[PDB]
Write a protein that binds this ligand. Structure first.
Ligand SMILES: C[C@@H]1CC(=O)Nc2cccc(-c3ccc4c(c3)c(C3CC3)nn4C)c2N1
Ligand SMILES: [Ca+2]
Length: 115
């Protein structure tokens, strides 16, 4: 199948919106990580490919995905970065886990529909 960018945006954006909507848990994930501002200067050493909700939104808005699994992969890159960088006690780690719970419910029917 050839997926048009407007079709991917229309189908997938609600699943991203579900993550944005989560408070407090989306807060760490709404903007790209700025290691200087956050006082975590080793972040890019450990996290080779940073990813966040706003970057994913921008990719949908600008037609950067050819396939819907590329979108799923970026969401999971964001999750895996957070579980990699943070210890299990951190808010960021626990908030990530909550987003993954929400996402799994949202994404399932949408991916089935897209095929
Ligand atoms: C995802 C990003 C990078 C990472 O993996 N660890 C990390 C460490 C310190 C603060 C943060 C961090 C970044 C932005 C935040 C926050 C934490 C938070 C606090 C509510 C949890 N609010 N916002 C706007 C952080 N999160
Ligand atoms: Ca809530």
């Amino acid at each position: 199948k050839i997926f048009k960018p407007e079709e991917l945006r229309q189908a997938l954006m609600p699943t991203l919106e579900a993550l944005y909507r989560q408070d407090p848990e989306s807060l760490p994930f709404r903007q790209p990580v700025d290691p200087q501002l956050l006082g975590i200067p080793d972040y890019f050493d450990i996290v080779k490919n940073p990813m966040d909700l706003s970057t994913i939104k921008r990719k949908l808005d600008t037609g950067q995905y050819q396939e819907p699994w590329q979108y799923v992969d970026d969401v999971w890159l964001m999750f895996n970065n957070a579980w990699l960088y943070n210890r299990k006690t951190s808010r960021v780690y626990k908030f990530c886990s909550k987003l993954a719970e929400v996402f799994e419910q949202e994404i399932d029917p949408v991916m089935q529909s897209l095929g």
